[PDB]
Design a protein around this ligand. Structure first.
Ligand code: TUL
Ligand code: CL
Length: 232
């Protein structure tokens, strides 16, 4: 299911059942985004990630989400973006520098060995929502699909999470992410804020922030199951 299905089919056919219900208020908007992508392709432009990966974050159960890690836009380099924020396919090398920095902090914080590869699917399977605010990008043009309609979709998703009484920890990397705090506050969620892991900002406070262990301390304090962050 790629852009054809995104344009033409109900959410219940595209994403996990809980997510389909949570996103119902933006069903028309998702369909419009499918048409946007079809228009791009008809104009001889590409987009990233692959159509089948665009909504991938919403294919893991809504009910199990306990941590939100928000990103801005997908990786712009062809072959990096896979529909989970910051993740790459297992054979990608070197890792994008943002992901290398995330993993540096992972090992510093948790004491586990560096991951074997850049595939964050295990986190998604364990209740971490790896959500970019904007879900597509034109190759090699960072942020090029900003303002095209994705923000309403992803805001709807985050609002649905925040509105639940269930515990939520939001890891908010950089200034754009910190704009989510009004929804999070009213939902009685907790945020961990730091500079972003991009090499542009990481050494101004991302390193040493210990977001993985802190998220788990917050979760346990709230009566939730912590995340098993261990990657192979
Ligand atoms: O998915 C990604 C990858 C890098 N950076 C951001 S903000 N999101
Ligand atoms: Cl189509």
């Amino acid at each position: 299911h790629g852009m054809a299905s995104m344009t033409a089919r109900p959410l219940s056919e595209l994403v996990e059942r809980g997510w389909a219900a949570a996103l119902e208020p933006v069903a028309d908007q998702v369909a419009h985004m499918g048409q946007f992508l079809r228009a791009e392709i008809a104009a001889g432009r590409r987009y990233l990630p692959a159509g089948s990966n665009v909504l991938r974050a919403f294919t893991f159960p809504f009910d199990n989400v306990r941590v939100l890690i928000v990103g801005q836009d997908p990786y712009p380099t062809p072959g990096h973006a896979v529909g989970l924020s910051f993740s790459v396919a297992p054979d990608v090398r070197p890792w994008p520098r943002s992901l290398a920095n995330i993993f540096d902090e992972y090992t510093a914080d948790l004491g586990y060995p560096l991951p074997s590869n850049g595939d964050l699917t295990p986190w998604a399977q364990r209740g971490v929502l790896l959500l970019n605010r904007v879900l597509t990008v034109r190759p090699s043009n960072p942020a090029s699909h900003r303002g095209k309609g994705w923000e309403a979709v992803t805001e709807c998703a985050i609002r649905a999470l925040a509105a639940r009484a269930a515990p939520l920890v939001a890891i908010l990397w950089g200034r754009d992410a910190s704009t989510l705090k009004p929804m999070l506050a009213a939902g009685n969620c907790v945020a961990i804020e730091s500079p972003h892991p991009s090499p542009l900002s990481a050494s101004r406070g991302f390193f040493g922030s210990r977001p993985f262990s802190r998220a788990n301390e917050l979760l346990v304090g709230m009566g939730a199951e912590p995340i098993d962050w261990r990657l192979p």
